[model samples]
Target chain A: LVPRGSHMNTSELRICRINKESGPCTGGEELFLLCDKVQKEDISVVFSTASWEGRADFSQADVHRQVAIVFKTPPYEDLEISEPVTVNVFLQRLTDGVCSEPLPFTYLPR
Target chain B: LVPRGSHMNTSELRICRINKESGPCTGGEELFLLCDKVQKEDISVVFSTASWEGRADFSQADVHRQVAIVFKTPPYEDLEISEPVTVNVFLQRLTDGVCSEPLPFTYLPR
Candidate 1:
């Protein structure tokens, strides 16, 4: 059987809101995210741009009630930049390779 | 009947973390907060200093699963300040006036 986001109980995977929309480019900043229902064991938080991709650090235990998550930001690809870098962050389903729409996160210079 | 934070299952009223720790002194900024278990209808988010006190704007429906709250910051007492002003933010119980330990939030000059 092919799994799809539409096949989930929460309709489609989505990240509703996050506490911090920007953080230091060096990363490891903790962020709180609220979202629609998601499977803790089968989800990933993806951060990417054209040349780089990283994943937010979160264990299954960080998923709260399948509707919220507490995670740490991944270090940006370039930490030495003088200005801010913006990238898209999204939720990716581990099982079926489906991804939610992206939210912009600005990586600020140190 | 007497009411107290300890009588609840989660042990006590508490604010775990908020998305943004600072914002413009003019306020009206949305902030996402994570917290321990609380009764949605009986809780309040209070922002205060020694002399000025304000309440975060949120409805009971903004409480998520008794563990999180989506609220807007109240404007600072003096919006014309040139320097950053810091205040304490905490969860308060409406029924008995019990409050949690405060976290600091800075109101930046606009």
Candidate 2:
């Protein structure tokens, strides 16, 4: 199913690369990403573990021409952990609820 | 002048971000970049200082769908420097010699 006003038909979703792979667990750190064409309003950046999940923060303006995104990482599920926690990061389409294969992100301890 | 077989015309060039901002002066470090649409065969990533310059290494296959590039840093002009040396890193269009505004990359002493 197609969303209204969206023309380009590259149905696939992908993330090319992220500027940084690890960051502070408190999580206000900004990140830059390159990816396949996407509808900014219909996408979310998710960070997840087997038991917990969170979403990165960004506005529609942060999506650059459908191929890139500038967003801030969300705080990890636990902020008091001593060791780094690695989680899955991926793009999720709101309309179809489809997702891209995930990349890993590590949250470092404070 | 227009190059052959390339359509979509957003003339502005921008560098969204790079994965690693600093690496050894001896170079050869890999970096991931997110950017504007590009012609893989007609683009080069240049790392430079006021008087010296070098090119990042990558093949056509390293360009991902024209919005991302995976490449290695070039060795600094003086690999034996005592302090970290910062340089300009930017994309150059081979066809028209136009370039995007640079981002700073630091080369650490080896």
Candidate 3:
């Protein structure tokens, strides 16, 4: 369901599955994201976490073709985590600068 | 000068300057391409050449905030060159799949 405006509706785009849902905080491991209507030009994914106050930590994710994307989890700012933390993931169309509703991802302790 | 159709007008989108226009075929060296009307959404540059018979050799380029683009020269196919070769460079708009007039680039032997 491709939306018709500057913003992408949640129903129009979604993450069907993620190859590796949980990973250590070291952040170099590759993860795959599969979705619908994704294989178009200028499509990119973003990995972000809102755990911080009033700000979102974000990193760019790489897209292959369009249907799938490869991304690495961002390293923890403190280099340590006592427990697993949840982050948000979203897809962006670089052309229109529109984004999809964020999905959840988990980053685990080393 | 942004064109009003599927293909970009050569006069509207021209490369004003290219940083490090000449480099070794070893590739991986960052080159900066600057042009007008480039900072728009879904803008990408391509490095291509028609030296390969009927088909053109092309590679996707990276754009930064729309004003500048950074791209690494592609690795030579045979890792050897007898003389400097010329390749074509062009800008593209991903949304409309339009391309600008191709400019010439010289690749030097390592």
Q: A1-110, model 2: which lDDT tens digit per residue? A: 34422222224888777889899999999898888888988998988887888999999999877888999999998899899888988888888777777789999997
C-alpha TM-score for every candidate: 0.81, 0.83, 0.39
Separately for all candidates shown, the number of backbone clashes (residues 3 or more apart, or on different chains) is 0, 0, 2
Q: What DockQ does each candidate score versus the true complex, computed on alpha carbons?
A: 0.67, 0.51, 0.02
Candidate 1 global CA lDDT score: 0.83
Q: What is the lDDT of residue A97 in candidate 3?
A: 62
Best by lDDT: 1
lDDT of each: 0.83, 0.82, 0.58
Record all residue pairs in model 2 with backbone atoms less than 3 Å apart, i.e. clashing: none
Model 3 / residue B14 / CA error / Å: 2.1
lDDT per residue (tens digit) for residues A7-109 in model 3: 4645556665565557776666656555656645556666665443111222333443344455655665555888887776677666766677777776777
Model 1: per-residue Cα lDDT over B1-85, one tens digit each: 2343342212377677888878999989988788888889899898888778899999998998788899999999999989999
Error of 3 at B31 (Å): 0.7
Clashing pairs in 1: none
Q: Could you say which candidate leads in DockQ?
A: 1
Task: Sort the candidates on lDDT, descending order.
Answer: 1, 2, 3
Candidate 1 lDDT, A1-110, residue by residue in tens: 23423432223788888888788999899887888878899998988886788999999999887888999999998899788888988887888777777789999996
Model 2: per-residue lDDT, tens digit, B66-93? 8788999999988799998889888888
* True contacts reproduced, candidate 3: 0.00
